[PDB]
Design a protein around this ligand. Structure first.
Ligand SMILES: Cc1ncc(COP(=O)(O)O)c(CNCCCCN)c1O
Ligand SMILES: Cc1ncc(COP(=O)(O)O)c(CNCCCCN)c1O
Ligand SMILES: Cc1ncc(COP(=O)(O)O)c(C=O)c1O
Ligand SMILES: Cc1ncc(COP(=O)(O)O)c(C=O)c1O
Lengths: 452, 456, 453, 452
């Protein structure tokens, strides 16, 4: 089967909007086969360990509503995965789609030679949106690129000052490209690619005592710290809330040593935590702020790295010191400008706070009833996780929830934990259903384990 | 005009309003251009305004890009229309707002633009099938991402995961090379000014002259001797940002044989040369070389979507099977980017645009080389392959003069990141024959103007 | 500006001269200063004046006086409370070591390095029997920093196939100045100009076991597992910093728990200085690898040893050329070491080190009370001691004042002005009392000096 | 036994000038035992592979004459090993022993606080002995310490100028401490200890274009080369002679790129190649010269790093930046000064030119006659090598030479090669004996490869 035939077969599929039964049965086996032969057979296996029966091979087809997804069989799922923090303003949010639609009619990608208007507008808007002295935005295409940019700003500012050491925390996830992977803390994700960047070190998350010692020792030996990088709340780490006061203490510690503070809000950002940015909870201003995922409104890929003029100015003298080819393209800018408008207009952060309190209270109730299965439920706003007693019970919860057409999934740096990350637009009724779905799942799990 | 003390909501409202405008008034344009410049100075980068001043004359620096004109042209806020010989630096291979491409994206946007990353997502599966079929020999598996630097990051990681257990950690790249600006790709990238401020980079990255098989062999052999064995060699088939440097005949074939001999992986960076630009779908098809890993981006997104693809043999890509989360990316291979790439692949094959690049590139280069002969006064030489081309001038200034002059004649050109004497000529492969003649015409006109400028 | 031959000739005649009348003395001193400036390091002249009075800066040393003194070219005798920073544990020209070196010089000073050399095998036997527990094999080299290099290389060769590559040291630590040792050495000013050093060296505060556990734990979580931990039992160049009781034992257990190797650096604390033969004997702690030098050469030869368990050292068995050095374990060096071990054990010098050390520290602690004026505190263990002063200048003055009194002391590399007191373990009881009397008059003069201003 | 006991036995053995046949047997038995149990069992296996059953046990006991050694069984060996380049003025050279004795009577080790006069004298003498602008000496204890000082000198000089990279050559042996080992090029000596110092690269020895390339590529990528380090003739590499003009072109290349040139003459130095320093064959002045081995007259361990005032001055403001504890002690200096006197008085470097040519004439003659055994013979002054067809044949030669009481040994970075590296004081008569034995060895070797 030649390339031309495949693209042709592919374009027709793209132009369909519904599938008759045989078209659907045929599409499914294609997708599985091609996943096996040309994507990654191991994904099919993972999907199996977290589902029951032929559910593993559920093929997704379209958005059903703001908060639901429909597979090729017409089956509709309430989305509690949120694409791991992407779909904050729902699937195919009308305002974001319209913005992207309109801009596509003019220009989707720019020449990168001329001044592009929306980059300017998104930079102005993010300047306005962000705390304090954060003034300048570099645009890129992803969370990991966003962090690459932050690291490079820190390096360019700090290396002429003789500081080269970066401190991150264990449990941290910061991206998978090799620069970001150097801060990313999970052993498994790191070792096969060593050596990574030199001069990266890790302290326990949420522990200012340990961090203070890290910086002190680095100073004594002339390996002075250039920057500290952390998530305000560790995402892939299993939704780990630092003790109240931590972020502020990290901020003070960085001030004292003249280290930069990098906040990775790729997952906590754009309202997910009940505020626009998680750092607004303790009102901490980083020197550099990393955004992505939800910044594209569920429609476009985009990352943004926002820093003070003091830091960002290292890119002024030679503007080509850091670039990327698609970064801040018009479609992506359109999407993010829409998203920002939607979040503020509909006060989605406050909604995240209220829906989050509600779900977590529900999950904490269920935790009380099933301590044979559940360890604890935790979270802030619409970033939640349920930790289970062990991995297999976790994988069974995800499976039982999928069976009830509610999408959930695990976290990258914590195997016992299932995240709950719905769109901030999840309705009150859907919230209750998600609780009811979790209850049935736990009851079923009791039976399955009890007999076994 | 929109206040300094403006709420985020207000800014977003203002911006959403502008997005909805199909056409700009004169006084609307005057206001928008003022905002954009101001916000560039204050929120993007004041330096990029300074740069634009150095490749334009007078007020041209403030040119604000506004929309596609036709397939091969762009229109600024003033309504001025430009023939595009820049091509988003290798992006716009099938023109601006290519109908088939825009169509696919639009169609996919109606279903689901971004995926959950949990369920099996069909356009990923399909673009992987398509690419496996579009690529030489044993290239079978694809990883999808959002840019060329991500494509290269994935390539280096694949090599690393494959070679690490075999005890090999060293990477060989070439001077002049450009592979990205993320810190991993940047280790392979070769320009001193893009690298130094960010050192230390990845350890164990070394460089040899591009085109020099003996130099490479010496690198690999010496690394073998010292127990610093080479994991992979990474190179472009033709150095783009280096200034369109073509290697000697058989070099790629030779690099392949050299990699086979040493047990190194061969990575080909076709982020710029790929998707038909140099006269074939992939530049490695000119010598018929099969790399172990092939990097794609830029033009793969049809000039509508951002996308990167990293494609490898099953033998190499299998390092990702036991643990499919070993390497991931949030947005990678999302439905929009896939639809865009599938459409682009279809367009390219259908209209035989790789063959068009050969012919239109042959025509253009030939005319450029002719201008080179007539104006040795200003021009060092003209080189290229398919629609990837360069004019090298005798100065640095002359090249900026030429850029400035061509802009004045509403033809878009720009310089290369690793060569300050070179102006690239990188038009859509859909550039009409008429538009070619105009380009040479403008090139001649500019060279003439530049000649009399000296004689002031 | 003579010829090389002419220069060497002059030097040989000087080497033959055992006495210098007033004529030769001034010519010599003038030469030595001039050549230091032009061919050695003009900066040592600056430092020396920095810690001397008037024309004390130009004190050219000439020969040993007695066990515990040095005489300069002007016939000025100094009591040695410097000890070559831990070298002269058995005094200057100790007859038993001097003799053993002459006897060996008469036979063979250096060896072929191809035939089995007896004194290397004998010394290894002797150190096996002198060292704690499973410490069995010895690698011989020429200096403290060389012995640390061998120790890093052993740990590396052992832990590399086991997948561990990170090394933990302590701040305040000093392990040598060759670039491998320098990676574990902790003083910023000694390290910075020579970076990048070896990757994967990290530092925890000395004496803080919870801090060390966190570092090992975190390195583990991220897949940068610690191969080894290196430390001095007592930090020397750091300023005689004593760990809390049980800390060394806790480091041993922590290492045991993480499967990291323990490297104990006793280059300075070893050969009796702290009251035992090895400082690790106070708590009965067995390192996997133990480093020795300085005093191991009896004050006559340069030598270092790196001693390890058969477990660790066996990495060198299959390829005995994997780690070597050219002069390492030569007959002269071994002869000196064997004589030194004999003198220490026979004359019970570590027990003496305890007694004299206590006597001296008492003395300094009393002076500390009488002069909070000038003295922060005095601390020590055995004959490894330090007086810490208020100012770094107050202290330069103490050193400079003691020098006028023909008592020799000097600073410590890591800290700003702490004076180490590291006299031969053979300091007489009477000499001890003179050192305390001198310290007193020095502080007295310094106080008067602070007024009168 | 206790440690006191052992030390006592050892001090009795040291005082013994000669051995009873039973004392000899007991000493030999105990030496092999302690080598096995306390030194390295492998070195005993190594000796076996280069001796004929039983000879491996030989325990060396004393210098015989100036050019011979005597084992415990009174067996006397002509020394063509030279302690791998140590014994240039013979064993127990009377002028060197005398010097060391006399200084030992006064003060063997310095205080490191008072100015020690022989340090001054040796640094003066070295400054006189060295080419051109070489002026300042740092004294240490070995070749590898000498290379360490050289690397640090280059580092302290070049790091403030933005240059951190080092170029060495394949085949190179520069020492085994971890800084020097970073330059030392033999795979087998390097891998188990990696990661070494970052930024060390290797080009092939004697290839000038490959070095221009490496220097220029490093300039291009911003990894500018701080120093180039090389032996004038690779020693452990198998006596590898660069083409005429190579060394000088390397010096000019360094000038061109502003890299410091470090010449490692730890083995080639002090007369061995026919000149006092091998760099004198082409009148090259490095920025930093490294010396050791024979610098201590075959009596003391000593190393020296000599540099231009321009380079060495990096240690002037803080003379404590780089030290070693025993470096430059009166004994080592006395030995070094005596050795310089002997070599100059007796015209020994020149003797090495004549004797080397004469010995290489014999070996070249033998290579003609035994092409079944010998690939080629080569040398510069008294630094010679015989390359055989196999590693095997080489081992056999070393063994046959050992039976004949002529001591030779292989080279660390070359398996087919046997070094011939005698004192420069080797007599003409002994030169003829060495050639006779080599001839005999080859004969036995031949007739015994034929009974196979
Ligand atoms: C604990 C410790 N470890 C290593 C060294 C270095 O010894 P060296 O023989 O290579 O110099 C030392 C040495 N310290 C004092 C510096 C002497 C020069 N003033 C040590 O204490
Ligand atoms: C050229 C060269 N450079 C350094 C060294 C190492 O000096 P060392 O005094 O630390 O050993 C050498 C020495 N190699 C021969 C020793 C082999 C084992 N007997 C050298 O040739
Ligand atoms: C905290 C954090 N940082 C960075 C990233 C990298 O994002 P991407 O996968 O888009 O590169 C992620 C993705 O999950 C994340 O959760
Ligand atoms: C060959 C090559 N590789 C990689 C890149 C970088 O990819 P991106 O700019 O999309 O991150 C470029 C960009 O010009 C390129 O030409």
């Amino acid at each position: 089967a030649s390339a031309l035939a495949c693209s042709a077969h592919a374009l027709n599929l793209i132009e369909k909007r519904t599938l008759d039964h045989e078209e659907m049965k045929a599409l499914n086996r294609e997708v599985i086969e091609y996943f096996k032969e040309h994507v990654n057979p191991g994904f099919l296996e993972y999907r199996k360990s977290v589902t029951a029966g032929g559910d593993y091979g559920a093929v997704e087809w379209q958005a059903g509503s703001l908060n639901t997804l429909v597979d090729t069989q017409g089956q509709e799922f309430i989305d509690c995965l949120g694409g791991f923090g992407i779909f904050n303003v729902g699937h195919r949010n009308p305002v974001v789609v319209s913005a992207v639609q309109n801009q596509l009619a003019k220009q989707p990608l720019h020449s990168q030679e001329l001044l592009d208007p929306l980059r300017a507008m998104l930079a102005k808007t993010l300047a306005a949106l962000t705390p304090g002295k954060l003034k300048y935005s570099f645009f890129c295409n992803s969370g990991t690129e966003s962090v690459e940019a932050a690291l490079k700003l820190a390096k360019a500012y700090q290396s002429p000052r003789g500081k080269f050491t970066f401190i991150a925390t264990s449990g941290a996830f910061h991206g998978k490209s090799l620069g970001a992977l150097s801060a990313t803390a999970k052993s498994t994700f790191r070792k096969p690619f060593m050596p990574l960047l030199p001069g990266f070190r890790h302290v326990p998350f949420g522990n200012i005592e340990a961090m203070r010692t890290a910086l002190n020792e680095c100073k004594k030996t002339g390996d002075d710290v250039a920057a500290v990088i952390l998530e305000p709340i560790q995402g892939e780490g299993g939704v780990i809330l630092p003790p109240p006061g931590y972020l502020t203490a990290v901020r003070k510690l960085c001030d004292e040593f003249g280290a930069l503070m990098i906040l990775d809000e790729v997952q906590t950002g754009m309202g997910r935590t009940g505020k626009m940015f998680a750092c607004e909870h303790e009102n901490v201003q980083p020197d550099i702020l990393c955004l992505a995922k939800a910044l594209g409104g569920g429609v476009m890929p985009i990352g943004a790295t926002i820093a003070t003029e003091e830091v960002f100015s290292v890119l002024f003298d030679n503007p080509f010191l850091h670039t990327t080819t698609f970064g801040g393209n018009p479609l992506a800018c359109a999407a993010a400008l829409a998203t920002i408008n939607v979040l503020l207009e509909q006060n989605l952060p406050a909604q995240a706070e209220q829906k989050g309190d509600m779900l977590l209270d529900g999950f904490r109730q269920l935790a009380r009833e099933y301590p044979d299965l559940v360890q604890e439920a935790r979270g802030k706003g619409m970033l939640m996780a349920i930790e289970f007693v062990d991995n297999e019970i976790g994988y069974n919860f995800a499976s039982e929830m999928f069976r009830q057409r509610v999408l959930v999934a695990g976290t990258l740096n914590n195997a016992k934990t299932i995240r709950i990350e719905p769109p901030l637009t999840l309705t009150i009724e859907q919230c209750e259903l998600v609780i009811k779905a979790a209850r049935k799942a736990l009851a079923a799990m009791r039976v399955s384990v009890e007999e076994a």
